[PDB]
């Protein structure tokens, strides 16, 4: 006993997250964090970032993000550089803190990324390399533990949000192939950073990108982005053996952006305004769905949470509850799910939470640069309120003039 | 034993603050900290802050503050934004350090706030949302544990100083209603971040805002701000069961600002110059009172500690001891109590301390911005000295010209 | 056993430094650190500092320093402000790191200071208040534990270097009275931050300021600064009961600055060029002395270590070894002793070390500001080499033009 | 048991790295880190650095570097100062983070350096002093533990990469003498920072500089830089008793820079383009070699890994595998080996890794300054990809115009 407990004592945790509880009952969303990254970066030394997803360990939640190694208001924030560049790096800082070289931990070299914590150590996945042969480097506790190479030679890419950990194994989804047609999609089961299983989904006429995956009662649910021909979001669920089912959110409250106005939906891809999209998320609650989506159907502007009690399986456009998150005239962007496990909260259920990226700059504003700040909310079964928590930076910046 | 001790070992504390000792005997105030926030922020990257209250754990004391996510000498420090904005965040740094995005921990999204440490974990309370439906989000150890929604739909607001913890439960006061007339006041008892009890005080003709609450011998004493019709400060005391008594400081040494010149007082609200006020504090010592107050009766200038041996219950304007803190020609501002518990100090009594916010900028100076720096003092039973420890920034700044 | 060891485990050390070993045999000085504070602060956000003394805990050595809450190249570094100001604060950072608001721990409000570590916790002493009634605030583990008020009402002042800890008690020297005549000098013995004993030395015709004190074989030796009428340095030694002896370094290698050229010395104050001085240090080795001193006899320029095998008791001007530290044409300044205890090094003897402050700016240069950077060396019994490790900042700065 | 385990518990490790395993089988190199130091330092406060070698403890890998105490875009980055200056300091930060005074730990005063971790504590070696009498100061756990003085009085210099630790002893190589002719070379065995053994190699007609040393199966292999008359790299291997063998890499894939075009090689120094060179590395795998080298044979541009299955012993210019690291039109520079021990990775073999310094500025660009950023890769037995990961800073900077 002494010997095993002293080893245990000697930031690595002891027990894996079980991932065996279901989502907590909730009525609304309480605001969890806001970093004011771009407002602070007007003067401070703050990274130009994209995709600030959140993921929690046993002691804290962190914001992971991609950066081009350039600071706001610096000449290198110039958007002349391709998103999939050799300078792109995945890094992480505490939630609610501005992403700075003075507070950000380096995680990986990556222009596409995922990260999660199995209760013992951080798993990070960072994809770099050329478009025709990218490699995901898989680190566990900061040590490289595996690699995954592109298998269709067409931009290997992954979640841009947290992977999902259940009972010592973490799960993620990756896409290889075009972003405007049929592609190839793989589910990976990874233990201690070592890929122990993977399956290629037989998903003809489906399209999966930038999956928001969360654990629920031992299984994993991913709600993703159909960039090909879908204005509703696709989903794939699977158990710990990668036995999977697939579909699209049936609700007529369409979840992607761009999208048509709400009307009768489909449990397959809604082709109207289906091309393009945005990373997003949803929480399945029985046959209902908590949908997070932009307010504008044409631009990435505004954000709302919508409870549709039958949205997972019924095609009508009716719902019960709308909670405002970002006002319709304010910029939003990518959004993603993250969870807080009972091991961290002491609750008996999986707490659902989500983050919203607030994009400022190009293409929609007269700057040389593009960046995002971050807000995030957690679902609670107590009183909540809608509002607008936008980015609030006054553009353009000094570097733009 | 072994298994319970290794669990304990694996920054969370083991034992709650008991809160069962009375205030230490003191004769004066020894200076504890000074951050020079605005002087440093002239060049460094330092937040524009307000309300820098102090609160201590078992290992350190921290300065909590509200910020608009803007830095000194940056264009976003422009005071064009409502105080209750969606950009306002509660954050904290070590005492005496300038509040910077590089040293400040994010706590909550809030334009009104409270925080305290029960001996195990930090409790934070941050109110955000619209004026007609604000929600206090209650986090314990950084995890959302409860919410409290506005019940009069008129700017739910709280202490702007530390809550008080006794025997595992922490206590705070909140106000809902107008700031210029009768409002509604509630006492909350919170355990592990979960509201276990609350009482609405029956306070006709009282006004409570920005309560400075401290524990004393198992009960909680709050000295607050009457913004309606009081130039002396109101007080409310209660036990751990929320049985409460109320009053106003009887001393003719009036504690609010603005206020009349010292004359015979009242144990009810002194209506002369009673409208408006400043957050402040006092320590009840038997039937005497340690009053911390501005020196000017009309502006937020100067600061002094005054020992009135009968001020709690007698209306005369006589006192025995005055210790200077900030000179009469220097800017002061909000002031608040904080305590150091026997668990932290090794003393057998509750140490009283206080912080003073030193406001620079609008409305009283020719800048585009308003901020504060921080000084703080602890009561001791040894030799002390009066002086003036002002902010010392040379205004206006570059951003103002 | 379990219960006491778990408490022990739960950064406070367990055992006090014994302080019972003598100084290690040494032949020379190996360079230990250099911070390049002013060179870095040309662009970075670095404090304007003075008196960067060093002191070591069980895990690290730290540089403590006094700052006016102003940064290099900022308008507030303007030397218009008195040294004994209400803005002066004692802070500390890791040795060899530039002193920045982003890496500096706040210690105390002080314009005169001392600090040391008894093996369990940091003791800090910071003097603030008016010239006619200054108070030293004594903190132990960051908690205020005592105060010491001025007893001659003439600028209470202390070491500006580390106090000396032996067997759980730490010792320091303080001066009250004029800096140009007979003053009053007190030795303090402090346990857990509580002054347990103090003696006023009967030192007619002596003058003690800015004492460099170190422990040696259970006793404490202080080598100080005679600002009245001495160009050699005064010393006072005492045991743990404050039974003391006094004298001046007899060597004709005069240790103060300004001073006359080396000639036959005195074991009393050498009046020639005796007025004024600089903080300095020496190590007594039997009847010999390691003297650290400026190279110029008129300015604070250059620095050398000189081994005089009979300098403690003989008045001749002969010595054996000179090791160059700072070249004669480069600026130096204050210098101080610090020690590394066997508990930290694992040696069986007290390691002697010293730091040199390198002053740049007013009065000797055409700037608006005065600051210092830091070098430091430790004595070793292995091969060493003399050189010049000057400050190396190119003055004046942008703020000066 | 209890007392020894609590002692152990009370960042120092318990067990030394054994160093008894051989190199892991690998097929390629997965990218491990990229710091974007110069791009970030365009605006942020980042050191001008050289030689950013990497070395790992039991908990993390750190980038050590030499700096002149000057920041990018600051006037003190002016290259007017000798490389071997008194301002040069060895410092370290986490891998992949920009080297800033706000995140960099001070290690030593040094213009030549080495560092490694024996599993318990950090060993650092920093050489300072004059060219005719430089002293390496050897610190262990930050405490000075030994000195090594120049023995030929001609620029004592060392690895500029990590030393190699086996079974509690760490090993390094030092050179004293000219950089364009026969010099003197010494192997040092150091335990707890104390030099326990050293041998002067009998190396007529060899030249050793800037050795990249790694442990392998109980012995140490160093691949170094022949600055005298060699365009292939020299190697020296030795056991823990300092019994050594020597040679040059036989492969016609020449590893130094400058060098001739690939042709039939030699197991002695290849005199063609042999003068000068660059710090580099190679991994011996049986009779084959993993060679890391620039792409250009005349300038420090580009970088590639080349697997030559017989390159260690055969002089042919044939190889089997080339993996691109930095493109031919991009600036590279020094390169060095580092290792990850089984104690850190949980593997059963020594993981090989390497870092590349990417030099920007003089002599090859029109700036006043010279600095480097950092990339690094680890060998893996899984899928990899070649690419170009260059520095990516747009030169010149503001300070240059
Ligand atoms: C998920 O599995 C965990 C681990 O088995 C369950 O937690 C344990 O449940 C048992 C039985 O009720 C308790 O006695 C233990 O104290 C629990 N903790 C541990 C660490 O084993 C958990 O209840 C399961 N969650 C469900 C079923 O929702
Ligand atoms: C100073 O005192 C300490 C503490 O008593 C001495 O260290 C102990 O010495 C004894 C007797 O030799 C050893 O058995 C212990 O292991 C030592 N350590 C402790 C923690 O007690 C130390 O040797 C003394 N120094 C001298 C005499 O120079
Ligand atoms: C200590 O180790 C024992 C087995 O040796 C295990 O049963 C126990 O849970 C451990 N205690 C902890 C991890 O607190
Ligand atoms: C504890 O002490 C024992 C006895 O000295 C030793 O064998 C062991 O390695 C130590 N550590 C642990 C983790 O048991
Ligand atoms: C951004 O890049 C373009 C060329 O791609 C250049 O013309 C422009 O000046 C750059 N802007 C800044 C602010 O550096
Ligand atoms: C879950 O974890 C347990 C305990 O480590 C393990 O034995 C089991 O195989 C895992 N799998 C499932 C499907 O529960
Ligand atoms: C408060 O309670 C604790 C725990 O029971 C006790 O040790 C302590 O003495 C009490 N304090 C006072 C002042 O009675
Ligand atoms: C502050 O805001 C006012 C009102 O919008 C504007 O006119 C002014 O230019 C602003 N000042 C700065 C320095 O941004
Ligand atoms: C543990 O405590 C015992 C007494 O209870 C003491 O003798 C022993 O030295 C302690 N061990 C430590 C501090 O490592
Ligand atoms: C260890 O566990 C015992 C038994 O639960 C408990 O009484 C004690 O307070 C714990 N802590 C210590 C430091 O002994
Ligand atoms: C310094 O202060 C003087 C007045 O005391 C003033 O004239 C001068 O402009 C100041 N310099 C700077 C750089 O602020
Ligand atoms: C030294 O420390 C011991 C042990 O704590 C204590 O008993 C003793 O009084 C101290 N004094 C001297 C003079 O050694
Ligand atoms: C190295 O030595 C350790 C300790 O004896 C042993 O456990 C390990 O297996 C050895 N490694 C190899 C590769 O033989
Ligand atoms: C760099 O040094 C040169 C030579 O001393 C000097 O002429 C030049 O002005 C310097 N440049 C800068 C930017 O300081
Ligand atoms: Ca779409
Ligand atoms: Ca519906
Ligand atoms: Ca009032
Ligand atoms: Ca009275
Ligand atoms: Ca003198
Ligand atoms: Ca002599
Ligand atoms: Ca060569
Ligand atoms: Ca070959």
| DSSP conformation letters of B229-291 | T-SSPEEEEE-TT--EEEEE---SS--SSS-PPS----SS---TT-SS----EEEEETTEEEE
Identify the residues whose C-beta falls under 6 Å from ligand 9: C 1, 4-5, 8, 14; D 3, 6-7
Strands (E), A72-205: 89-94, 105-109, 112-117, 122-128, 135-140, 143-149, 164-166, 169-176, 184-191, 194-200
Q: What is the largest CA-CA distance in chain D?
A: 66
Q: Tokens 């090989």 identify what position?
A: D352
Rounded to the nearest angstrom, the minimum Cα separation between C5 and chain D is 7
Q: Which atom of ligand 10 is nearest to the CA of B4?
A: 2
CB contact under 8 A, A40 and B106: no
* Spatial contact of B266 and B217, defined as CB atoms under 8 Å apart: no
**C62 known ligand binder:** no
Q: What span, in angstroms and rounded, lies between the C-alpha atoms of A302 and A85?
A: 29
Query: Please, which residues have CB within 8 angstroms of residue C345's CB and are 6 or more apart in sequence?
Result: C351, D143
Residue A360 Cα, ligand 5 centroid: separation in angstroms? 18
Ligand 14 pocket, residue D398 CB under 6 Å: no
Say whether residue C69 is in contact with chain D using an 8 A CB cutoff: no
Resolution for this experimental structure (Å): 1.8
Residue D202 Cα, ligand 22 centroid: separation in angstroms? 29
Structural fold of domain D16-391: Neuraminidase (2.120.10)
- For residue C165 the two structure tokens come to 């800890």
Tell me how far the alpha carbon of residue D142 is from its chain's centroid.
21
Cβ-based burial of A89 (10 A; exposed 0-12, middle 13-18, buried ≥19): buried
* Spatial contact of C305 and C29, defined as CB atoms under 8 Å apart: yes
Tell me how far the alpha carbon of residue C267 is from its chain's centroid.
23
Q: Where are the alpha helices (DSSP H) in D182-318?
A: none
Q: What span, in angstroms and rounded, lies between the C-alpha atoms of C223 and C208?
A: 9
User: What is the Cβ-side half-sphere exposure of residue D179, based on CA atoms within 13 angstroms?
Assistant: 12
Q: Radius of gyration of chain B from Cα atoms?
A: 20
Q: For ligand 14, atom 1, which residue shows the shortest CA distance?
A: D78
- For residue C358 the two structure tokens come to 């390198």
- For residue A376 the two structure tokens come to 């995030």
With CA atoms as reference, the chain D residue closest to C353 would be: D144
Say whether residue B105 is in contact with chain A using an 8 A CB cutoff: yes
* Spatial contact of D170 and D122, defined as CB atoms under 8 Å apart: no
Q: What span, in angstroms and rounded, lies between the C-alpha atoms of A306 and A335?
A: 14
- Chain D CB contacts of C14 under 8 Å are 10
Q: Tokens 């600061």 identify what position?
A: B303
Query: Cα dist. D17→A4, B200, D12, D120 in Å?
Result: 21, 64, 13, 8
Nearest CA among B125, B121, B120 for reference residue B135: B125
Strands (E), B131-193: 135-140, 143-149, 164-166, 169-176, 184-191
Rounded to the nearest angstrom, the minimum Cα separation between A64 and chain B is 16
Q: Where are the alpha helices (DSSP H) in B32-106?
A: 37-41
- For residue D44 the two structure tokens come to 């942020």
The CA-CA-CA angle for residues A178, A180, A186, to 5°, reads 45
- Chain B CB contacts of C86 under 8 Å are 34, 387-390, 392
Reduce the DSSP state of residue C343 to 3 states and report it.
helix
- Chain C CB contacts of B380 under 8 Å are 144, 147
Catalytic residue among C206, C216, C334, C391: C334
Strands (E), A252-315: 281-285, 288-293, 301-308
Name the helix (H) or strand (E) containing C211. none
CB contact under 8 A, A384 and B147: yes
- Given the DSSP bridges, would you call strands A370-380 and A351-361 parallel, antiparallel or unpaired? antiparallel
Say whether residue C97 is in contact with chain D using an 8 A CB cutoff: yes
Query: Cα dist. B228→B212, B274, B278, B335 in Å?
Result: 18, 6, 12, 19
Residue B76 Cα, ligand 22 centroid: separation in angstroms? 63
Q: What span, in angstroms and rounded, lies between the C-alpha atoms of B97 and B36?
A: 8
Cβ-based burial of A245 (10 A; exposed 0-12, middle 13-18, buried ≥19): exposed
Residues of D tagged active-site: 83, 334
Bridge-partner residues for A135, per DSSP? A128, A149
Q: What span, in angstroms and rounded, lies between the C-alpha atoms of C180 and C203?
A: 15
**CB atoms closer than 10 angstroms to residue B295:** 21
CB contact under 8 A, C43 and D106: no
Report C:317-346 residues touching D (Cβ under 8 A). 340, 344-345
Cβ-based burial of A204 (10 A; exposed 0-12, middle 13-18, buried ≥19): exposed
Give, as one character, the DSSP assignment of residue C40: H
**CB atoms closer than 10 angstroms to residue B275:** 15
Tell me how far the alpha carbon of residue A47 is from its chain's centroid.
19
The closest CB to that of A75, out of D44, D95, D394, belongs to D394
Q: Tokens 């003297």 identify what position?
A: C291
**CB atoms closer than 10 angstroms to residue C322:** 15
Rounded to the nearest angstrom, the minimum Cα separation between B182 and chain A is 25
The closest CB to that of B1, out of C2, C101, C144, belongs to C2
CB contact under 8 A, D144 and C380: yes
Q: Tokens 């804290």 identify what position?
A: A60
The CATH class for the domain spanning B16-400 reads mainly beta
Nearest CA among A12, A94, A84 for reference residue A52: A94
* Spatial contact of A4 and B1, defined as CB atoms under 8 Å apart: no
Rounded to the nearest angstrom, the minimum Cα separation between A277 and chain D is 30
* Spatial contact of B310 and B370, defined as CB atoms under 8 Å apart: no
CB contact under 8 A, B97 and C104: yes
- For residue C277 the two structure tokens come to 């001085």
Strands (E), C309-393: 321-331, 335-340, 351-361, 370-380
Reduce the DSSP state of residue B109 to 3 states and report it.
strand
**CB atoms closer than 10 angstroms to residue C15:** 12
Q: What span, in angstroms and rounded, lies between the C-alpha atoms of B174 and B210?
A: 8
Tell me how far the alpha carbon of residue D7 is from its chain's centroid.
35
Q: What span, in angstroms and rounded, lies between the C-alpha atoms of A249 and A314?
A: 9
* Spatial contact of D288 and D308, defined as CB atoms under 8 Å apart: yes
Say whether residue D396 is in contact with chain A using an 8 A CB cutoff: no
Sign of the CA dihedral running B249, B251, B256, B258: positive
Say whether residue C31 is in contact with chain D using an 8 A CB cutoff: yes
- Dihedral angle, C-alpha C13, C16, C22, C23, nearest 10 °: 30
Long-range pairs for C232-238: beta carbons < 8 A, 24 or more residues apart: C232/C256, C232/C259, C232/C265, C232/C266, C232/C269, C232/C270, C233/C280, C233/C282, C234/C206, C234/C207, C234/C208, C234/C269, C235/C282, C235/C284, C236/C173, C236/C185, C236/C187, C236/C201, C236/C203, C236/C208, C236/C211, C238/C171, C238/C187
- Chain C CB contacts of D149 under 8 Å are 383-385
Nearest CA among A38, A119, A128, A55 for reference residue A92: A55
With CA atoms as reference, the chain D residue closest to C347 would be: D145
Structural fold of domain A20-386: Neuraminidase (2.120.10)
Listing DSSP states for A5-54 in one string gives HHHHH----SS-----S-BPP-SEEEEEEE--HHHHHTTS--EEEEEEEE
Say whether residue A102 is in contact with chain D using an 8 A CB cutoff: yes
- For residue A181 the two structure tokens come to 């047609």
What b/e readout covers C328-345, taking b as 16+ CB neighbours within 10 angstroms?
eebbbbbbbbbbbbbbbb
Reduce the DSSP state of residue D353 to 3 states and report it.
strand
- Chain C CB contacts of B98 under 8 Å are 101
Q: What span, in angstroms and rounded, lies between the C-alpha atoms of A135 and A127?
A: 5
Q: What is the largest CA-CA distance in chain C?
A: 66
Ligand 8 pocket test: pick from B368, B370, B398, B401 the residue with the most ligand atoms within 8 Å of its Cβ: B368
Sign of the CA dihedral running A197, A201, A207, A211: negative
Report C:36-65 residues touching B (Cβ under 8 A). 45
* Spatial contact of A379 and B143, defined as CB atoms under 8 Å apart: no
**CB atoms closer than 10 angstroms to residue D263:** 13
CB contact under 8 A, D385 and A6: no
Bridge-partner residues for D56, per DSSP? D61
Neighbours of C, requiring at least 3 CB pairs below 8 Å, are: B, D
Cβ-based burial of D105 (10 A; exposed 0-12, middle 13-18, buried ≥19): middle
Q: Radius of gyration of chain C from Cα atoms?
A: 20
Cis peptide bond prior to D258, omega within 30° of 0: yes
Long-range pairs for B7-11: beta carbons < 8 A, 24 or more residues apart: B8/C6, B8/C10, B9/A9, B9/C6, B9/C9, B9/C10, B10/A8, B10/A9, B10/A14, B11/B57, B11/B59
Say whether residue C146 is in contact with chain B using an 8 A CB cutoff: yes
Residue A382 Cα, ligand 1 centroid: separation in angstroms? 26
With CA atoms as reference, the chain D residue closest to A127 would be: D31
Give, as one character, the DSSP assignment of residue C180: S
Q: What span, in angstroms and rounded, lies between the C-alpha atoms of A355 and A51?
A: 10
Residue C8 Cα, ligand 9 centroid: separation in angstroms? 8
- Dihedral angle, C-alpha A254, A260, A266, A268, nearest 10 °: -90
Nearest CA among D201, D208, D169, D162 for reference residue D61: D162
Q: What span, in angstroms and rounded, lies between the C-alpha atoms of D360 and A329?
A: 44
Q: What span, in angstroms and rounded, lies between the C-alpha atoms of A42 and A23?
A: 39
Resolved by:
X-ray
Reduce the DSSP state of residue A316 to 3 states and report it.
coil
Q: What span, in angstroms and rounded, lies between the C-alpha atoms of A64 and A54?
A: 6
Q: Where are the alpha helices (DSSP H) in B1-148?
A: 2-9, 37-41
User: What is the Cβ-side half-sphere exposure of residue C237, based on CA atoms within 13 angstroms?
Assistant: 14
Query: Cα dist. C214→B305, C23, C90 in Å?
Result: 40, 10, 21
Q: What span, in angstroms and rounded, lies between the C-alpha atoms of D211 and D200?
A: 15
Identify the residues whose C-beta falls under 6 Å from ligand 7: B 18, 20-21, 348
Is it true that domain C15-400 has CATH number 2.120.10.10? yes
Sign of the CA dihedral running C266, C269, C271, C274: positive
Residue C167 Cα, ligand 12 centroid: separation in angstroms? 6
* Spatial contact of B228 and B274, defined as CB atoms under 8 Å apart: yes
Q: What span, in angstroms and rounded, lies between the C-alpha atoms of D255 and D260?
A: 10
């Amino acid at each position: 006993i002494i010997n095993d407990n002293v080893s245990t004592i000697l930031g690595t945790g002891s027990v894996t997250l079980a991932g065996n509880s279901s989502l907590c009952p909730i009525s609304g969303w309480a605001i969890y964090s806001k970093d004011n990254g771009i407002r602070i970066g007007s003067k401070g030394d703050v990274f130009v970032i994209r995709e600030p997803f959140i993921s929690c360990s046993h002691l804290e939640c962190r914001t992971f993000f991609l950066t081009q190694g350039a600071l706001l208001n610096d000449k290198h924030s110039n958007g002349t550089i391709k998103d999939r560049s050799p300078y792109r790096t995945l890094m992480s800082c505490p939630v609610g803190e501005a992403p700075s070289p003075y507070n950000s931990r380096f995680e990986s070299v990556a222009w596409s990324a995922s990260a999660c914590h199995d209760g013992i150590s951080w798993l990070t996945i960072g994809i770099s390399g050329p478009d025709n042969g990218a490699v995901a480097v898989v680190k566990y506790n900061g040590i490289i533990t595996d690699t995954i190479k592109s298998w269709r030679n067409k931009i290997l890419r992954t979640q841009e949000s947290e992977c999902a950990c259940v009972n010592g194994s973490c799960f993620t989804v990756m896409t290889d192939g075009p972003s405007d047609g049929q592609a190839s999609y793989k589910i990976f089961k990874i233990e201690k950073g070592k890929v122990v299983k993977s399956v290629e989904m037989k998903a003809p006429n489906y399209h999966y990108e930038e999956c928001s995956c969360y654990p629920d009662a031992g299984d994993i649910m991913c709600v993703c982005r159909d960039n090909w021909h879908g204005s509703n979001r696709p989903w794939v669920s699977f158990n710990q053996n990668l036995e999977y089912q697939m579909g699209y959110i049936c609700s007529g409250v369409f979840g992607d952006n761009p999208r048509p106005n709400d009307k009768t939906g489909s449990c397959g891809p809604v082709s109207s305004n289906g091309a393009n999209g945005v990373k997003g998320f949803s929480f399945k609650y029985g046959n209902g769905v908590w949908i997070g989506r932009t307010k504008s159907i044409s631009s990435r502007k505004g954000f709302e949470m919508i409870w549709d009690p039958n949205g997972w399986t019924e095609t009508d456009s009716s719902f019960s509850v709308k909670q405002d998150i970002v006002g319709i005239n304010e910029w939003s962007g990518y959004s993603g799910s993250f969870v807080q496990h009972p091991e961290m909260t002491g609750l008996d259920c999986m707490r659902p939470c989500f983050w919203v990226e607030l994009i400022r700059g190009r293409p929609e504003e007269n700057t040389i640069w593009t960046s995002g700040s971050s807000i995030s909310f957690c679902g609670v079964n107590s009183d909540t309120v809608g509002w607008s928590w936008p980015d609030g930076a006054e553009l353009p910046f000094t570097i733009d003039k």
